[PDB]
Every structure is written in structure tokens, then in C-alpha cells.
Amino acid sequence: MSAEHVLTMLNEHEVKFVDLRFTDTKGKEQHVTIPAHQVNAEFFEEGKMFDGSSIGGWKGDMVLMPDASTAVIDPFFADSTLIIRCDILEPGTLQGYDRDPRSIAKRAEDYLRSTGIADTVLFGPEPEFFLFDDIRFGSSISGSHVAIDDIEGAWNSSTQYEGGNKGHRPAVKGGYFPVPPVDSAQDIRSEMCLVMEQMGLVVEAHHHEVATAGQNEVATRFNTMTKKADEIQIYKYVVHNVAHRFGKTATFMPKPMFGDNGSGMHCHMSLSKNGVNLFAGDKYAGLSEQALYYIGGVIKHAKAINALANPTTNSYKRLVPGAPVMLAYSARNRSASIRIPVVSSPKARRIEVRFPDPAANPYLCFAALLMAGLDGIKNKIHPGEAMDKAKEIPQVAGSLEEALNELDLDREFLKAGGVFTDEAIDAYIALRREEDDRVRMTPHPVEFELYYSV
Amino acid sequence: MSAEHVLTMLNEHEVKFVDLRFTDTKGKEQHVTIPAHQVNAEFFEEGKMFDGSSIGGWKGDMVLMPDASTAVIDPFFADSTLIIRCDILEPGTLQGYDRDPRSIAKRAEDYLRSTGIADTVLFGPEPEFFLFDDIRFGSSISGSHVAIDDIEGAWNSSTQYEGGNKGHRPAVKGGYFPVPPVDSAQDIRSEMCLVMEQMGLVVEAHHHEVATAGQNEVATRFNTMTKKADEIQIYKYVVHNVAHRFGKTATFMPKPMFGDNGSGMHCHMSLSKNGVNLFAGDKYAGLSEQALYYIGGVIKHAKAINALANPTTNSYKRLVPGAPVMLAYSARNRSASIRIPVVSSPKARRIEVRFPDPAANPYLCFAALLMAGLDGIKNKIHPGEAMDAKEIPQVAGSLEEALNELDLDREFLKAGGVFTDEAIDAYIALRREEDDRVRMTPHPVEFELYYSV
Amino acid sequence: MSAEHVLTMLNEHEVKFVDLRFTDTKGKEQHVTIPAHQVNAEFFEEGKMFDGSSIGGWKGDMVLMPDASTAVIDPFFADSTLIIRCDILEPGTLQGYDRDPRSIAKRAEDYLRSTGIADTVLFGPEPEFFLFDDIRFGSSISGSHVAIDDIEGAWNSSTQYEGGNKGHRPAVKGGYFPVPPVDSAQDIRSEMCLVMEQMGLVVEAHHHEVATAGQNEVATRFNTMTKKADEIQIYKYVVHNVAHRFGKTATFMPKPMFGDNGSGMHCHMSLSKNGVNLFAGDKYAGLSEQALYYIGGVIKHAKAINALANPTTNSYKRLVPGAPVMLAYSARNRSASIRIPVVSSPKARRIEVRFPDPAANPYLCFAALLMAGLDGIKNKIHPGEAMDAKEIPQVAGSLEEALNELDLDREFLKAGGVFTDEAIDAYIALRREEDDRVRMTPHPVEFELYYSV
Amino acid sequence: ADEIQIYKYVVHNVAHRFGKTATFMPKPMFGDNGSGMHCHMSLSKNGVNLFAGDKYAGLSEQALYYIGGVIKHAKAINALANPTTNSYKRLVPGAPVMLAYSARNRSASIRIPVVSSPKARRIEVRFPDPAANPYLCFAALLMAGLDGIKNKIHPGEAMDKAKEIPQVAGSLEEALNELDLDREFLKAGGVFTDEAIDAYIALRREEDDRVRMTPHPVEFELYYSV
Ligand SMILES: [Mn+2]
Ligand SMILES: [Mn+2]
Ligand SMILES: [Mn+2]
Questions:
Q1: Which is catalytic among the residues A162, A334, A447, A449?
Q2: Where L-glutamate is bound, by residue (chain A)?
Q3: Is A392 a catalytic residue?
């Protein structure tokens, strides 16, 4: 699909507006809209100049360069709008901006191709989300508060409702996965799936999740790295907008509630060259030597990866023992962060990395995982024996500060081939350290419950 | 478009009413409606008499003269109405009223043509605005209050709403520019753009701005001075009416909230003669010597300009250090009030003056900027080197300072009869009244600071 | 009164606590309490160490040195407490801290003695205050508010009260000075006077003032500079605490309400040497040449004085024309900021400076006035003829102007080492912080004026 | 320590009698100053102050060695002097966090008060908070000082003049780990027992785990939309 096809769409669908979209360092989607008559052949060659100083980690003019292959009609805007995803390029050389996550992911794929290890990398993430009816939160000198409310919440079993309380609710850790009316999100999940199919995703399934307050997941088909990162951005956009249109509120926080299961994003990975899966072989669980080296690299650089795959303090609320935290690989053990799914055909052999959570920036997380795996392959890092059976077993970072320190001290595997720059890594670390400092310095209601009388 | 075309439009659109519009000194549109059958050939030659004594700064029987080229159908009135912009002429000589902003802008353009420096002046303003759900304000002997409420306001993260609180809101200084549902004004901005295009504006983009409580901007294509002033008036009208129709409330105040970004109107300028941009050259950032002289004039008369480009006390609550307050020109520095945008095509070479605000009267602000630039060109005022510190001049720190500088620096505005001493005095008094009100009313922050001392 | 007398009082009144009090740069009393048994002979020679880094303008271990002559029993604390006023001394040399207002006032008196012009300076200040039933104020990103409520407020003529609304209230600018029940503060003022006399003040009169929302003043007898500054501190303390005990709320703000009279502190001054008033003579209004020179100095340095006598932004909301803003001296004219009261006895001859306000730090304001007068005497500055118009100098129109003039006019304060450059800079910065807050926070009147424009 | 217990009891009960409620939490409010417990220390033998001398700020070699021991075992001490997670919301840069001694510097965690009489010479350790157990905190400070004296741990030059300067523990987990690894100076002389230290560490780790695992409203403010 090209600029000619985009210009044809503009007339086929009577498009009034075009929404240029991109992703910031934190992973949030930013969009700027231009009227359709401003889109011409020169638009796809020169882009649009915008001031990126107001973006989070880009504080120093840059060019928004549309990627026509990402053109897709917006199903939510009242006026006919076309969504084109864009890369941020330097104004003069029209080269990828060092801090652009999409550019970083594209450079990671290019480095993968250059090294000769493989031709394509396949990513399948499995994000989950929470649907709520009401969320209220605030902080000030006088205190702080968070209050989550959902009709499916078990704590509402005593709530008085206009029209009566209907009782049927999923119990705590009991929403996987009863039939309605206990499951009250069937229609919303189906409509999300249909909208995703319209927007270009291939949906594999959708269902309710373990937690009680409307935890749901829509499982979509795998895809190449940058393509699947764009697909994840579309996925989050669709979930948020559908929840808003149904009177709900979607959230991808790793751990919104205590005592109930959190939300994770298991990332399936595979490598292919000339249409041949390189992770298929005669080694453990049908893996290959390349697959074992990839696992070893991911294990070695797991703490550095955590700074990008679990970039929020809330993520380490779910990355606690008792959500796997052990850095080992096993096809059966459920305490291993890395698992090898049992698959019939070798063409579908893959490794599932389970610690990542959906709050991660898709581009940066996937790039970090791929770069760690490639470092493992290049340096032939053997991961050891499978954890089929203990303080010798390495674990994921226990805090965002630890993850950021490890990323600071372990930058080489990300700087290999120019995928990541020291400036980009420093900007990311500072941007996350600001949030970490705020959370560290704000008191805690549990701290009052524990220490007020002491 | 002429009178014959207006009379044709009346039958084509089954127009029932014609709304004659003009701008007062403060910059607010004033409209008087007449039935369509009152519009004939004699109407476009003799105008309509109206009593302007009750207008703000026009206190002493003037003529409303329609400008058919401005004819446009109103998209909001229930009855089919046609909007015609009008100049205010003296009843006898039918010459422009000295205190009419549109007449002043037209005279500024005519002076530009007469001096021979250029044929046309191009202005790209970039106003921003705030959208709110509720605004309450008042004052009395017992006290004074202002309370802003918007669903996008971060402070509503704790508010209880009927139907539940959806927690997707912009953070403070974090509304630039995430996708919905964090951005809740996509449909409103799209409707504004479509209506603006209906009313004759060329839209370039629209987006959410840095501030949290629904700050938005719709960018429109540049145009000649008087045309772009009319376009800014139409822009403000469309924004206000669309926000009203969506249940919102638009404001062009420079600084409605403290601790969040204010609203400004960056003014891009360029001069063209015989179709060639005169601001394009081999000097700094591709500028020409005339461009440098224009920058120098704007810098020299910046404080006087502030009285017209930042005519509200609230304006100087965004023109505070920690900022676009330094009177210097640079292509890279964010601290310079004058920027040279990086444009590949020399035909697009221009200077961006950053200090103005959308509360300014468009006609008067543009005329002041043009006249300062022309004074710089005529007197060959060199702006010095680009700012790539205490000696650097700054914009006026208060409306009183701006008005005093305007009082003491009238010549560059009186060149060519564009501004008249009477008009300048009327403007200064009209603004000094508001300044006195704000200066004499006590402040809640003053209570917070001094109640116990 | 000395240390022996203080130790005797401790047993005489069965004192349980001793409250050491001092004044910060802004003029607020700070108190630290110690048990009575911690007070001994060594206490009055070595003082008490305290950490002043957290005080307003004292940021860098200083000594609180009690002044036994100021010992007085607190009339409000439940436990028998003795109030001793203390100076702030450097720990090593035991010399007055450069930024201690009381030390500055003492040094001003010592300089007056050293120059030989006079032996003593007499100050009669006349502060006024407001009594309210409820005050609510706040500011945030969403807005800001202030709401004053008092039963005497004219706006309460329509309010519904439990038990009924009694309609006897002062009108706006009509509280000077009808009998009760229109005046509802007779008992409060009488209690204030009695407590003040208990605390060592000599009261002359008390009455309701012009404003409606419970403006009152209690007049006290003049006294020497430092003594009268301590008396003013005791006055403010007594007013605040008595109002609190009566369910009211006292404020010494210059201008709490718009459209009603503000609160001022007229400062009467005179100089005496060997028991003869030096301000008595055969010149205008019975003044002497030294009195005229004092007036001339005060006029010359009036703007610099304003930074200390009117140190709040709110102050310049009462120093507005339509007013005591003209820097001239006359015995009859109400427009002159300096008056010569008509007194039969030459011993009572004095000059009344009208612009100061009760929000001023008493020590710093009195020291500034005295130093300006002494500069006028030394340099023989003639104030011209009595003002019995645009050329007449006026007081500073803003706190920024006052602070700039203080920055540029420090010499008359640095004469004799009274004020130190570091102290002046600290004061200027401390006031500029508040000025910046008030300058950057938007105004409800600004919304009323500019929301639609 | 008994006096501190009586102090806390009296404060709580008087506040209750007046209708108020008192708390010794290190940091109940964000954006405003927290509550601390500066501990002044001095050793005396035969009525003679052993911290008086001709060294810096009138200190003695024993005083400097005591300071050095406190600095060396500061992180282990923190597990007892700052035994709550809230404590480390007070011990944040922007400060009392730098482990150095000075008579003037406000950033020094150890301060030497300027006192005329040598008999009153002492060292003030500023990081401890009032949530600490007085007995255990004072015992830890004394044992660290005695280890410094016994091993002649010189504290270096005073901080009268930066990543080389050691800092107090940044979290209760760090403090507990350092206490676990630095038991010897507390176990000297049988004062602390391994069982007692383990019980303390487990008891505090329970609270640390609860606070670590419960989500935060600021976390919602920051991450709900991401
Ligand atoms: Mn799942
Ligand atoms: Mn903008
Ligand atoms: Mn009076």
C-alpha cells in the first residue's frame, strides 16, 4: 500500500480529515489532525513540521513522515477521518530521530537483518486490561485516595442499585471464565474484536480474565516486530475508545488492585530466515541452539529489559513472589518467567517471555527483547538447564529503581548497531526516574495503617 | 465578489436576514441585523446610519458601509442569515472613521503600498483557546471569586460524576497531544474546522495544546493583513458558537489558569512586492536586509506594540520570565520573542513574533506590527546579532508600562495618518479604565499572603 | 525593671512559663516558651540558642537575649506565663544581628544620639484594624476566591439569621461613628483597651472607623521609637487574641474590601533634645527649620520608605488617587501625605506622615522614617512651600516601584551602619517573592473584564 | 529511653484529652516538613566529658572515632533508627542524608553543636526519626560508636567545604539488608543476639512487604492512562 492508494482512499471514503499518529517515549499515542485537502503527493515526501519540545522526553522542530502502509479509517470520530502512523525524522537529514520509539524498533529490525542471524522476527504479545465503571484518584498535602468501582466487582455484592442488585458477579480470582450474566463484558469484548478487525488486526480470541473487576483480554495474531507494535497501539486505542463508548473505562495498569490478579503482556518470540523457523530444533522442547542462546541473552539482560518492559512502579506490584519472577526456562514449570509452549508444528516453535506488562512501550520493549536475544546469539550465552524441578536462580528486578540502574550499567546490548543511543537511554531513564521519585516521596495509606500509632 | 453577487446570493440561499458586522476598539464583534428586503443597490452605496455613541471608545451618527467581498452565510442562526462585514465611515465625507480598527488596518496597508517598500503584507496568526464546561466569576464588596471547571481538568481526577468518573484526563502541561479518550475535543475541533471552511477559512491543522483544561488550537492559512484580521474575527466567532453548541465555553484569555500554559497568538509576517518575497535573502537564516530592519523596528517599538498586541492585564500573566519575553531574534533559541522558522522554500521566508496574545484586537495589533516594521525599514534599524543578558530588552512587564510606552512612542503609528492622536488617546483611556479596576480590586492571593500580617 | 525584678515577678505571679518573643523581617511575632525554672541569672547574660535558619529572611545558630525591661504577664494563656521581648544576637560577639528589626531600630536610635541632632525621637502611630466574623480564601489551578462575612457588613441587610436579622448595621463608609446597636464592637474595644493597659500600654481613645465591616481603632499614647514598636507588637497581639476570644477575627491588612475605606497607620513624629521639642519654632505652622528639613528628607526618600512602610501589594490598593498620595506638607489640606497637627502646646509640635499602613514592620518602618528625616536634616533638604499639580511627587504606585527605589536609594538607610546591604537585599527578595505570587496569579476581575475578549 | 516512652504517652493522652490526635510518623504529609528525632550523644568517665578536646570543633580523638563508627555503620543503624518505610520519605535529598560531620553545614547528618562549656560537648546525629524504638536505636548508636572507638575508625575531614560521600539508606529494604550483613558491631558483648536481629528483620520486612505490594494513588495518577 502506497501514497497513491492513500489518495484513492481519501476519495473512496470521502475522508474529511487525516490523523497523523506517533508514539512518545512513555508509549502514549500522540495525534495531530490535518484536513484531507492538505494531503498530496508532496505530503508523503516532505512530511509535516511540528514542535516536539512539549513531548515528554524530546525536550531539546521535527518532521512527521507518514507511513502510507499504516493507513486506516478511524471508526470513532464523527467526521470521516483517516489514521496514518508517522515516524519522527530530523528536519535536515530526514533520518530517524534518536529518541523515536518507532525509529528505534525499525533500526532494531535492520540490525537483525544486517547481522545475518535471521531475516524476520515474529512477536506475539498477549496484553490484558481492566474495565471499570468509575475511577477516582487524587493527591494533595492533606492526603491521597484511589477508589475503583465496577458492577462486576465482588465488593458490590452489598451495594444498593437503582433497579435492584442482580447478584451475579465474579468472585475474587474467579472470573476465568464463567458464562453470562456473571460475565458482563461479552458484548463489549465482541465489539472490540470487530473494531480491531476493521482496523486491521487479526483476532484469535477474547475472554474474561482471572480478576473480578472486569479483567478481560483479546488475543490477536502475532506479527513482525514493528508491525505488531503498531498493532498494539491500535489495540490499546480500540480498547480505550470502545470502553468509553460503552460507559466504561479501560486501563492497562499492571496492578490496579491488591489481592487480585494483575495484568500482564506475555511476549511470544520467534526468528525466521528464508521462511524457516530458527527456533525449531532437536534440543530441549524442540528448541534449537539459536533458541537457547536467545533465552540465555534474555536471562542475562533481564533486569535491563525490565526498565523497558516493566517501566512503571506499579509493574513491580505484580512482579512479586507468589506473575513469574524466576529467570529460567521450562516447558512445564509455571514458576519460570520464560516458557516454551507445546506446539504441534515446528514452524510455530517459539519462546514466551512472561514478565512484561502492558504498560510497556511496545516498540522499546520489543527492541530490548530482540537486542538481548541477539546479544545472546552472538556471544553464545548458554542459559543452562531447564527449570523442570534456590537462591542461585536469578530473578527479575524487584523495583523500577533497580531496573533503571541495571539499564544504566548494561547499555551495550542496546547500543549494538546504533539501535539505542546513550542520549536516548539517558532521556528514558530520567523520564522514568521522575515518576519513581514522585511515588517514592508520596506517603502511603498503608503506611498510615501501619505506623500512625507508632 | 460584489453587490450583484450578494444580491444573487440572497435569492440563491433564500436569505431572510443580513447581519452587518464590525469591530470595536477592544476587538469585539458588534452586529446589527436587517431583513433581506432592506438590502438593495442603494444599500451598498449609502450604507446604514447607526448611533455609535454607546460603543466603547467612540463617544463624541456614523455609517455602516458593507464590504460585499466579505459576504458569507451564517452557519448558526436558525433563520437563513448573510454576514457582511462593514467599515465605519463618517456620515458626510464617507471616509473611514479615525477610531475604526478595520479602517486603521486598511490605512496601514495603503501606507505600506505608498511607501514603495512592498505591495502586500502576509500575516499568519496562530491563536489558541481554552474550552471549559463551567466558568463562574464575580466580585463585590464582600469578596471576589473565579472558579473554572472542565471535565478534562486534572483536578477532576477525584470528582464524583453521575454515571461514573472516567479517569482519562490530560495532566498539567500534558495535553500536547495524546489521543482520545484523554483528548475529548476531537469532534469539537473537527466541527470547528468544517464550519471555518464553510465560512471561507483555509484550515491547516487542529490539535490539543499543552494545558490541561481543554486548551486547543486550530491553525489557519496565512493571508493579507485586513483579510486575515477578518479571518481571525470569523475564527473567534466560530470557536465561541461551536463551543456553545457543544455545551462548552471558549475563551481567548491569555492566562485563565495559574500553573498551566497560557494562550498566545504567534504572528508570522512577510512582505511581498511583485510576487517575490522581500524577506528572503542571504543574511542570517536566509533573511534579507529588509527583514533584519523589520525585526529591528519591531524590537525597538516592542513595548509600544505590547499596548495593542497584549492589551489586557491578564496578558502580562503569561509574559512572565520562566519565556517569550526577550526582545531578540534567533532561529533556534526558545527564549527569543522573534523566531525565524526553518522553511525550505524561500517564498515561505518569514519572521514569527511570539509575544502577542489572542485577546488583542487583530486589526490594531497587525497594524502596529506592520508600522513598527516599516519604521525599522525606513530608518534602517539594525537589530544586532542573533541571540544564539541584563542588557537584552524585554517586552513590557505590565499594561501600565505598555500604555505609557505607547503614549510616549506614537510617531511610528502616526506615520502616514494611519493612527491619529485622538484614536491613540481613546484607546489608552479605554484600557486604563480596565487596568484601574484590576489594580484597585483586592486579590485572594493578597489575603493568603497578608491576612495575618 | 531588671533581671532581679523579673525573678521577683516569677515568684510573685506564680509564673509557670516564660515566652521569649521577637520580630522577624516581615513583622510577625515569633515566640518560644521555656519553663520558669529555666530562667536564672545566667539566662539574662547568656540568652538562649535557637535555630533561625527556618525564619523568613534569616537563612544563612543565634542567641535570644531577653530584655528584662519588656517583661509582662500574658493575659491569654491558661497557664501563668511571662512575656519577655528578646533581641537576636550573633553567638560569638553577642552583637545585634544585622537582619533583626529590633536591633536595626536600636541602632537607628543610637545613630540619632551620635549625630547630636537630638536625644530622643517620639513616635505616635495610629493603626486601624478590621473585625470579621468569617474569612475564607483560597487559590488553586481551577481558580481563586475570597469571601469576607461580618454581622456589621451592610451586605448582610438581606441575610437570614437564626433568631432573626436585626437591621442596625453601618452603611458603606458610614461607621464613623454611630452609637450601638449600629456599633456592635463597643465591648470588644473596651476589652482590648483594658487588656492593653494591663500589658503596659496607655490608651487614649477607641472608636468605630469609617468602613462598614467592623473597622475599629484604639489610639495609644506616643512613645520612643523602639518602645513604641514593641507597643505596636503588643497592640497587634492583644487585638488578635481578644477578637479570637470574642469569636471575631482581626486583620491589619491595608485594604481588605473594595469600595470601602482601608486601614492606615498615621505616624506622628517629633524630636527632643534635653527635654525641649526641636520641631517647635516660628516657621510654618509653628515648625522649626529642623522640622522642615525632616519633612524634606521624608519627601525625598518617600518612595524608598514605601518599601518598608507599605510592604504589601495590598497596601497600594489604598494608596490610590481618590487621597493621601501627594508628597507635600500642609496643616489644612486633606490631600497632603504629611500633616502638621494643630496643637496649642509647642511641646506637642509634630509631623504626621499619613501613607504608612499597619501591615508594616514597626521597627523597620520607624527606622526608615527616622533615617530619612536625619538625612534631610544633615543635608538641609528644604521641602519647598506648603501645599496650601503634575509636578508634585507622589508615593510609589506599586510594591515593585517601592522595592526598586529602595534598591537604588540605600544610602540614607546605610548611614551609620543602621541598615546593611545584606539586610536590604534580603528584605527586597523576601518581598519580591510575594509580589511575584500576586503578579502571576490571575484575577477574578480579569475574568470579569476579559473572559469574552 | 524510658523518658521518651513517657513523652510519647503524655503527648498522645494530652492530645486525646484536648480533642486532638497526635502522631510521631516521620512524614504524614507530602510537600511539608517531616518529623525527626535528633539524638545528641556524649560519653563521660569519672565525671569528665570524653568528647571534649583540642580537635575539630573542640572534639577529642574518642569523639572523632565515635563519629567514624556511626558513619561506617550508618546504614545498619538506619534499620533501627528509621524502622518504617515512611521514614525514608523524610530521608530524601532536598539535607540530613549525607554521612559527614560538620559544625556549620546543614547538609551534614552529623553535627557538632557550638557550646561554650566543654562539659557539654556532644555530637548530634540528625537522621533518626521518632518512630524508632528508643532502646534499640540508642543501643545501636552506642554500639556503632564503641566499635569506632575500639577499631580507631577515623571519620576523615569535616564537611566544611560529591558522589563519594556516603549516604544513609535510601529504603527500609536497604537498611534491613545492611543490618543483616553488618551484625557484628551489635553482637559485640552479647548485647544483640542473632535471634533478636532476625526477629526484628522479619517483623519489619512484613510491613515493608505490605507497603511494597499495595498500589499507590500516585501510581494511578501517573499510569492509569498508560
Ligand atoms: Mn491471559
Ligand atoms: Mn501552538
Ligand atoms: Mn482613624
A1: A334
A2: 261-262, 318, 334, 354
A3: no
